[PDB]
Symmetry: C5
């Protein structure tokens, strides 16, 4: 049971498909607090328009303040074109790059699904498990291991 | 989407392939920044390059000469008969992401990667579709402000 | 198939980072890697560090942090990704594999790939030495030793 | 309507599928000269075994001399294995990297086709349009805009 | 290029050891072609091996940092299996080999085979009526090594 009362965590989330984003952020926040003793005042939450902006928003934020771990949250749903595949591939590499360039643990809270239902299910609705909870724990664990 | 950026300097680089779709996209972006976010016309630079492949390179060259708070890269790639479309799309997207992360300047994705021309026009606001350029205009202002201030 | 060496690395310091998803398959892999280095290459138990991270996504990051603090001759990254219902599997697998390659090239430290990217659980267990399969961890142990010695 | 009498242009082309390569190179050269007033003596032409060497040949050459723009030309045809897919992906990312790293515009004269007929058609044979011309014009434009 | 001779060239060859049946002929073809057709000296050709294709980029990087080579040939054979392992390793190795060559300035020749089954690999190694691809790689190493001088 890892506890991180002194950890400063950053959460950057996109605003596309808010129906699925909100639950994810909550589950992450609630879990860090209620289960890892992270302090609410130590959790910064920022948003960007879409998943494409996630890597950029995180990079700008960890250059200004100091965080022990970051959680990038976004929901990409396959559409009619190849837009979904290209954005997904670029964003995932971008998030990995920002983490490796900065030395700050970047947790993957990106969902890349085929339809809305799949997203809601992974956000804890319709009998599914909220994946945000897992991301909060990973944030805490990686943040501690980085000291 | 309420944000105002009267002091923001925005750069728009667009390719010239599939101009039928490019033009509306650029207008929607410009119009939205101006009428909805108070950006000043004189603070918006517009440049062009032959194709989407040049977008990353054109943007890189420009943000090295002047100072911008945000950049919008606009291009239209349509699937053809070869694998050309797939390889260019992949490299361009990775290039635009790199330019943004290397420079610290927000780069907005105004790239359409479609199966046929009808899909592009529809996303440019023609034939009953929503003009995606508008969303790009708003995103540029938002990311520009979250960096300058 | 592979062609391991008989090389001995009694002075080698080896690091093993593994994720914790699908532990059923992870455990046998790690054991095989450790046992093989020790019993077959003369690596010393005390010279093998073992760390863990939540998921495969964390592997490149955990390895990067660890080789920045201590000095290792070789690193083995171990994780198990199983195709699910979304495209999550494809995108994480691609990013992690490129990430592990980058950490190895940036640092100069050999990073051994102990990542399984499978369609279902049965395939993972089979590659972990269960149900009549060959334990791939063993091969990784020999590779770690071989690369660690060629870096000296 | 762009003219570049002082531009120095480099062309690196592979030698696999020369039947398609030659016309592509000619089209690019002819167009730069005849339509953009580029001078014959200001156009260097080099070759490398295959498309895989394109990025490397270009990087080496722009480190020795000064060019305003580079055109990389090569032809990849899908074969029986996955070789085509992996080389294509690596070469394209390689050419983009060299352009961004060096600051010198790199024009994409790479064809990634399914069979030989497709390549010849794009080289102007059998009633097709010679793509090399477009690459010549793009080189001139990007070379001028780099100043 | 007429007939290139490189009697003073120093060439490095790193090959993996998976699927040796196909590897050996590939290496021979490359060595023989360099010596017999390009006048490269046997004593100027270093040959190293690594467990698998995943180690090629790393093995090559370590070696060119210790000695000086005019060109490098990376040889490995990947065969599609029952999982997605082949696809991910192939993509990462190919990008890794391109990176090492561009980072170092030393030409890295691609002697990697990414096939669907063993038969395809043997064929490309010169068995069963096929053309030994290692020969072409040898000539490419010599040509690129000379053009770097
Ligand atoms: O986070 C998402 N962003 C999306 N917008 C695209 C992109 O993230 C940027 O907001 C904008 O394209 C300019 O950068 C999506 N779609 O377009 O479908 C989506 O599904 N999810
Ligand atoms: O912007 C585009 N550029 C295209 N040209 C490719 C590239 O952008 C350059 O113009 C040229 O290849 C040399 O750099 C396209 N097609 O070829 O189809 C396309 O659909 N869209
Ligand atoms: O190692 C794995 N990690 C997984 N977790 C995802 C990721 O590795 C991180 O733990 C988390 O996503 C945010 O960092 C997996 N799935 O989700 O399926 C999986 O199959 N294997
Ligand atoms: O330019 C090409 N090079 C090719 N050769 C591969 C590569 O470009 C190098 O010459 C050599 O592989 C070593 O780097 C091709 N095929 O193999 O099919 C091809 O179609 N086109
Ligand atoms: O060179 C190869 N290496 C292989 N081994 C994988 C890898 O190259 C590493 O040696 C090891 O996986 C961890 O470093 C292969 N397969 O697994 O199938 C293969 O086909 N070819």
């Amino acid at each position: 049971d890892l506890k991180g009362p002194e950890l400063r965590i950053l959460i950057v989330h996109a605003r596309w498909n808010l129906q699925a984003i909100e639950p994810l952020v909550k589950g992450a926040v609630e879990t860090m607090i209620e289960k890892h003793d992270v302090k609410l005042e130590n959790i910064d939450i920022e948003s960007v328009p879409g998943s494409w902006e996630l890597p950029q928003g995180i990079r700008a934020s960890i250059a200004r303040n100091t965080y022990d771990a970051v959680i990038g949250i976004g929901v990409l749903i396959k559409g009619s074109t190849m837009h979904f595949e290209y954005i997904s591939e670029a964003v995932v590499h971008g998030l990995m790059r920002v983490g490796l360039d900065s030395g700050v643990p970047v947790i993957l809270g990106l969902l890349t699904v085929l339809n809305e239902e799949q997203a809601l299910y992974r956000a804890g609705l319709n009998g599914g498990h909220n994946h945000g909870n897992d991301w909060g724990s990973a944030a805490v664990e990686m943040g501690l291991k980085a000291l």
